Amino acid sequence: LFPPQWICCDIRYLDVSILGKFAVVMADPPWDIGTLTDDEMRRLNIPVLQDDGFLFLWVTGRAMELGRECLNLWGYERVDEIIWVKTNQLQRIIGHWLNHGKEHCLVGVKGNPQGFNQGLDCDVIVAEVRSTSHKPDEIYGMIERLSPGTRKIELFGRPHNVQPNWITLGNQLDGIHLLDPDVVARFKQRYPDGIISK
Numbered sequence: 441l442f443p444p445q446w447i448c449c450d451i452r453y454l455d456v457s458i459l460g461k462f463a464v465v466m467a468d469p470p471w472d473i474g475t476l477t478d479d480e481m482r483r484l485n486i487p488v489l490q491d492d493g494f495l496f497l498w499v500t501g502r503a504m505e506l507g508r509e510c511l512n513l514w515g516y517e518r519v520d521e522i523i524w525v526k527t528n529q530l531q532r533i534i535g536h537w538l539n540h541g542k543e544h545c546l547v548g549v550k551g552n553p554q555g556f557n558q559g560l561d562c563d564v565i566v567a568e569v570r571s572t573s574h575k576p577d578e579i580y581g582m583i584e585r586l587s588p589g590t591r592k593i594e595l596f597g598r599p600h601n602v603q604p605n606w607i608t609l610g611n612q613l614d615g616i617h618l619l620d621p622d623v624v625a626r627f628k629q630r631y632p633d634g635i636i637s638k
C-alpha cells in the first residue's frame with residue numbers, strides 16, 4: 441500500500457518478521473560512539489528483512505568500521521559508499537585531525553537483485569544541512585530511481601522521514617500507522633493487544 445506507513449517501537453524488540461521482504465533497507469542507527477551497544481546493533485534481525493536487494497547504512501567515526509562489521513554479519517557485501525557533502529544555502533561546504541565536510545552511507549548488496557536501475561545516480565550528494573542529524577531527502581530520490589515502486593523500510597527514522605512506499609521504524613514516531621493489508625494482518629496476529637514488549 442503506497443502511502444507512508446510507520447511503527448513507533450523499540451527496534452531491538454519488535455518482531456520484524458511480520459513486515460515481509462523489502463527491496464531496499466535504510467538504517468541511520470544511533471551508534472554508541474537512546475544509543476545501542478555494539479552487540480545490540482550486531483543482534484538486530486536485519487537478515488529476515490530481505491532476500492535480494494540493497495542496504496543503505498549511515499556511519500560515522502568508528503561506526504565506519506563497526507558498520508562494515510554489521511553489514512557483513514547481516515549477510516551483505518559492501519558494493520558502494522555514498523558521501524553527502526554538507527553545504528549551506530550558498531553551496532559552500534559546512535574526528536579531531538580534520539574538519540568534517542561529509543557524512544558516509546555504506547551500500548550493501550544481498551542475494552542477486554534483478555531489475556534495479558544501477559548507474560543512474562552517482563555516489564556524491566551535495567545538499568544543505570537541514571537540522572541536527574537530519575539526512576538529506578535526496579537519498580529517497582536516488583533509492584526510488586534505483587528501485588521504482590518497490591517496498592522499502594527505514595530503521596531509526598523520525599516523523600520527517602516517512603515517505604510513500606516506505607515503512608518507517610523509530611521510537612520517536614507517533615503511534616502505529618499501517619495500511620498494507622498483509623502487514624496489518626500479521627501485525628494483529630503477532631500483536632493482538634497492540635503492544636510490543638520482548
Ligand SMILES: CC(C)[C@@H]1N(Cc2ccc(C(=O)NC[C@]3(O)CCCN(c4cc(NCc5ccccc5)ncn4)C3)cc2)CC12CCC2
Binds near residue numbers: 451500574597612
Ligand atoms: C553519520 C550518520 C551516523 C548520521 N545519523 C546520526 C543519527 C542521529 C539521530 C538519529 C535519531 O534521532 N533517530 C530517532 C531515534 O528515535 C532517536 C532515539 C533512539 N532511536 C531508536 C532506538 C531504538 N531501540 C534502542 C534504545 C536504547 C535506549 C533507549 C531507547 C531505545 N528503537 C528505535 N529507535 C532513534 C539517527 C541517526 C544522522 C546521520 C544521517 C545524516 C547524519
